[PDB]
Amino acid sequence: KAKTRSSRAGLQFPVGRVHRLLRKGNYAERVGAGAPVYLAAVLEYLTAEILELAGNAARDNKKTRIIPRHLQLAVRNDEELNKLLGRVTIAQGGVLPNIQSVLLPK
């Protein structure tokens, strides 16, 4: 009976794959046991946040399928993810629908 590490961490992301990528990624000669659990938790939380806001944008766009336009809306609307992804280009995302107030008609 082999039971996965992701369930023991209570997470969804693969703890074993994360530990493998750590050990072959050449970051240190040793890797602790709970560290890839923490990596999987952080990655899963970021994924959950961006997917939640993408689903919110899709429901605003009355869609039940996430497209990259919803992704650009979710990234550029939330301030924390926009600061984390300030140097980031999303292909086929477009821009935010922003118009400068001077350019509006009188």
């Binding site: 992301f13 000669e29 952080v42 899963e44 997917l51 399928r65 990259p68």
Partner: protein, 95 residues
């Protein structure tokens, strides 16, 4: 080999956990792997330099805890610290 390494099933089941009524597009799906991959190398590289500066030879939860508190914004970093410690505690309690 022809098989590829991707986080497709994991991001799709995270989507099903969050919104269990929403599909996902393939270009958006590759964008999900793009997200997961490069935040993996930024957080891992931050942990690498953090271990290098203190002359440590292992990556523990402390190094990435500092890395997440550094790179992530404040509420994202705080939430990630809290639930990462929760996941570590659940992993260690279940051994």
């Amino acid at each position: 080999k022809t098989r590829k390494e991707s986080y497709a099933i994991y991001v799709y089941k995270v989507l099903k956990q969050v919104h269990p009524d929403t599909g996902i597009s393939s270009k958006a799906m590759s964008i999900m792997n793009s997200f997961v991959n490069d935040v993996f190398e930024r957080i891992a590289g931050e942990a690498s330099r953090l271990a290098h500066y203190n002359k440590r030879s292992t990556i523990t939860s402390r190094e990435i805890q500092t890395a997440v508190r550094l790179l992530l914004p404040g509420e994202l970093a705080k939430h990630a610290v809290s639930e990462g410690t929760k996941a570590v505690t659940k992993y260690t309690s279940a051994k």
